[PDB]
Amino acid sequence: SALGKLQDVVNQNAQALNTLVKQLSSNFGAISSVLNDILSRLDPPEAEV
Amino acid sequence: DSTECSNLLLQYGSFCTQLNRALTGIAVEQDKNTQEVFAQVKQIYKTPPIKDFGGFNFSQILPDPSKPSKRSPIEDLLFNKVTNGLTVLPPLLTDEMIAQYTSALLAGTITSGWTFGAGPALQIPFPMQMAYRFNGIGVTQNVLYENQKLIANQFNSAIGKIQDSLSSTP
Amino acid sequence: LTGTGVLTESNKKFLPFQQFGRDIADTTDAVRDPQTLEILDITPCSFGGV
Amino acid sequence: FCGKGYHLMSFPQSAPHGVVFLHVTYVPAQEKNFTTAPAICHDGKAHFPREGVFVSNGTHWFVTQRNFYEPQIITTDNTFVSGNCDVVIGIVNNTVYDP
Amino acid sequence: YTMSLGAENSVAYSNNSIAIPTNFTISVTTEILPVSMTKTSVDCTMYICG
Numbered sequence: 558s559a560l561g562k563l564q565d566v567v568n569q570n571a572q573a574l575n576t577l578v579k580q581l582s583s584n585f586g587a588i589s590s591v592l593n594d595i596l597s598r599l600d601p602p603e604a605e606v
Numbered sequence: 607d608s609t610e611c612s613n614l615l616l617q618y619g620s621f622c623t624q625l626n627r628a629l630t631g632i633a634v635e636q637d638k639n640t641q642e643v644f645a646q647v648k649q650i651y652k653t654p655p656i657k658d659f660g661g662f663n664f665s666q667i668l669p670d671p672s673k674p675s676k677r678s679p680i681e682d683l684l685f686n687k688v689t690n691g692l693t694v695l696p697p698l699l700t701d702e703m704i705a706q707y708t709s710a711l712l713a714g715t716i717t718s719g720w721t722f723g724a725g726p727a728l729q730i731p732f733p734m735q736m737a738y739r740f741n742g743i744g745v746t747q748n749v750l751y752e753n754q755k756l757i758a759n760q761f762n763s764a765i766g767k768i769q770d771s772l773s774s775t776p
Numbered sequence: 777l778t779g780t781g782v783l784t785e786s787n788k789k790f791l792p793f794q795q796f797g798r799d800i801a802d803t804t805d806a807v808r809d810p811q812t813l814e815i816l817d818i819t820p821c822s823f824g825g826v
Numbered sequence: 827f828c829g830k831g832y833h834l835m836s837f838p839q840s841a842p843h844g845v846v847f848l849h850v851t852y853v854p855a856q857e858k859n860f861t862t863a864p865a866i867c868h869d870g871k872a873h874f875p876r877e878g879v880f881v882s883n884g885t886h887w888f889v890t891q892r893n894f895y896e897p898q899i900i901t902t903d904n905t906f907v908s909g910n911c912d913v914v915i916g917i918v919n920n921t922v923y924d925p
Numbered sequence: 926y927t928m929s930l931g932a933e934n935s936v937a938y939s940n941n942s943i944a945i946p947t948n949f950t951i952s953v954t955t956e957i958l959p960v961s962m963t964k965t966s967v968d969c970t971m972y973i974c975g
């Protein structure tokens with residue numbers, strides 16, 4: 558644990574990137590989190606929503 | 607306690623985890639700040655029972671034995687002058703231990719000079735410590751020694767004016 | 777299942793039931809093609825900053 | 827600011843996304859008690875050290891530098907004269923050698 | 926437990942005694958300071974929409 562100050566910054570940046578990548582898996586109230594599924598399932602008036 | 611609200615909140619992902627982690631980082635940063643400010647000594651120093659410092663009076667800044675909080679009169683005045691899922695975490699260092707740290711720093715800088723901050727605490731008489739400080743600002747030791755009563759009286763008067771100004775300014 | 781990428785040979789030992797694969801982001805990273813049952817890896821097409 | 831103790835010098839070392847400073851510092855050690863005085867009274871005159879401090883091992887008075895014990899004979903070369911002995915509190919009587 | 930703040934040391938103060946070091950220790954200590962982070966860039970249009 559001698560080099561914990563640099564490893565803390567590295568872990569925080571990697572964890573922020575992992576959270577930002579993980580946030581793509583959430584649909585945020587939509588029917589799906591995948592854009593291609595929405596674009597292949599729905600007409601543009603509701604796919605727009 | 608609404609379960610439908612939490613079921614809809616799970617659609618937004620790990621926002622709550624990020625907010626909790628940011629607040630946890632702030633909470634440990636406050637304790638790290640207090641640790642860096644006050645815990646600069648690993649030896650808890652005490653003043654001698656006899657307060658013979660060559661006329662210099664430190665009673666307004668040394669801890670009062672009559673008070674149960676073991677605070678100085680100035681520190682006691684300072685503490686008197688400051689007045690749904692929410693929780694307040696207590697600080698890691700209590701006010702008694704912060705007062706103990708400041709008491710140790712005061713005892714070190716009174717009895718040992720700046721020597722305790724660079725190594726072992728080496729005792730030195732306070733009218734000699736003061737002469738060393740006078741030589742640090744480029745004034746000869748003799749000036750301090752010849753006028754030691756006037757400097758002690760000025761220091762005690764200034765400390766009393768500090769207490770009066772803190773007690774008289776909101 | 778729709779998407780864009782380069783389909784390449786893979787060395788991932790899929791179990792018989794297993795059909796596709798997903799990354800951390802949940803985007804499909806490998807797929808088993810129908811009719812021929814082979815396992816195709818899906819690698820995003822090259823991109824970057826100009 | 828540059829390590830614990832009296833700072834002498836420092837060495838920089840590169841680190842992944844950081845810097846490592848090797849602070850070389852001077853730490854006092856093996857301290858010893860001595861009996862001290864603010865001034866030396868001699869011939870009706872008060873003598874004060876130019877850069878050091880008066881110490882006594884019990885019978886004899888010396889002057890030494892403040893951060894290291896190096897006793898030397900109290901002479902006029904390392905002391906200066908200011909005033910008489912009536913003003914300084916705690917002045918002691920000792921001879922001052924003249925080279 | 927209730928944590929201790931330090932080992933307790935009583936300084937032998939008196940009005941005519943001084944402590945002078947007779948020796949010294951050359952002490953080398955480490956200080957680690959972060960300087961930079963990983964330079965990350967995110968294509969906002971590709972992240973939101975692909």
Ligand SMILES: *[C@@H]1O[C@H](CO)[C@@H](O[C@@H]2O[C@H](CO)[C@@H](O)[C@H](O)[C@H]2NC(C)=O)[C@H](O)[C@H]1NC(C)=O
Nearest residue numbers: 657658659661662663664665666679762765766
């Ligand atoms: C140091 O200062 C304190 C406070 O100024 C002095 O205590 C005062 O003493 C007088 C007479 O003994 C009392 O009338 C005051 O009420 C005291 N003040 C307080 C706040 O207690 C003290 O005498 C001074 N000298 C020493 C050697 O402690």
Ligand SMILES: *[C@@H]1O[C@H](CO)[C@@H](O[C@@H]2O[C@H](CO)[C@@H](O)[C@H](O)[C@H]2NC(C)=O)[C@H](O)[C@H]1NC(C)=O
Nearest residue numbers: 860881882883884885886887888896897898899
């Ligand atoms: C204080 O230091 C002085 C100087 O080192 C000591 O005086 C010497 O003591 C030795 C040992 O008895 C003698 O051989 C020398 O002749 C002395 N020198 C002089 C100039 O007198 C003195 O003994 C020390 N005192 C104590 C209590 O340690």
Ligand SMILES: *[C@@H]1O[C@H](CO)[C@@H](O[C@@H]2O[C@H](CO)[C@@H](O)[C@H](O)[C@H]2NC(C)=O)[C@H](O)[C@H]1NC(C)=O
Nearest residue numbers: 867868869870871910911912916917918919920
């Ligand atoms: C230091 O020396 C001075 C002067 O030699 C001493 O002062 C004398 O003290 C005696 C009795 O104490 C008096 O009779 C003289 O009149 C004093 N002379 C002066 C010029 O003041 C002093 O007592 C000595 N101190 C010690 C501790 O030995």
Ligand SMILES: *[C@@H]1O[C@H](CO)[C@@H](O[C@@H]2O[C@H](CO)[C@@H](O)[C@H](O)[C@H]2NC(C)=O)[C@H](O)[C@H]1NC(C)=O
Nearest residue numbers: 654856857858859860935936937938942944945
């Ligand atoms: C200088 O002298 C003082 C007092 O003569 C010493 O302080 C004593 O040290 C012993 C051993 O550590 C303790 O048991 C006593 O309680 C201390 N007394 C006081 C009043 O603090 C001190 O150790 C001496 N310094 C050196 C370097 O020997």
Ligand SMILES: *[C@@H]1O[C@H](CO)[C@@H](O[C@@H]2O[C@H](CO)[C@@H](O)[C@H](O)[C@H]2NC(C)=O)[C@H](O)[C@H]1NC(C)=O
Nearest residue numbers: 853854855856857895946947948949950951952
């Ligand atoms: C000052 O301290 C140093 C070490 O901090 C002492 O050097 C040691 O001396 C002993 C006995 O002479 C040897 O066995 C060691 O090997 C020495 N260590 C080193 C690193 O050289 C030195 O003697 C001390 N000096 C005084 C005057 O106390």
Ligand SMILES: *[C@@H]1O[C@H](CO)[C@@H](O)[C@H](O)[C@H]1NC(C)=O
Nearest residue numbers: 795808809810811812813814
């Ligand atoms: C048709 O697909 C099935 C599996 O769905 C496979 O077993 C069969 O071999 C395929 N036939 C041809 C002609 O590709």
Ligand SMILES: *[C@@H]1O[C@H](CO)[C@@H](O)[C@H](O)[C@H]1NC(C)=O
Nearest residue numbers: 658660915916917939940941
């Ligand atoms: C130091 O204190 C003692 C009493 O403990 C006293 O006799 C002596 O005169 C004092 N010396 C100085 C320089 O204040």
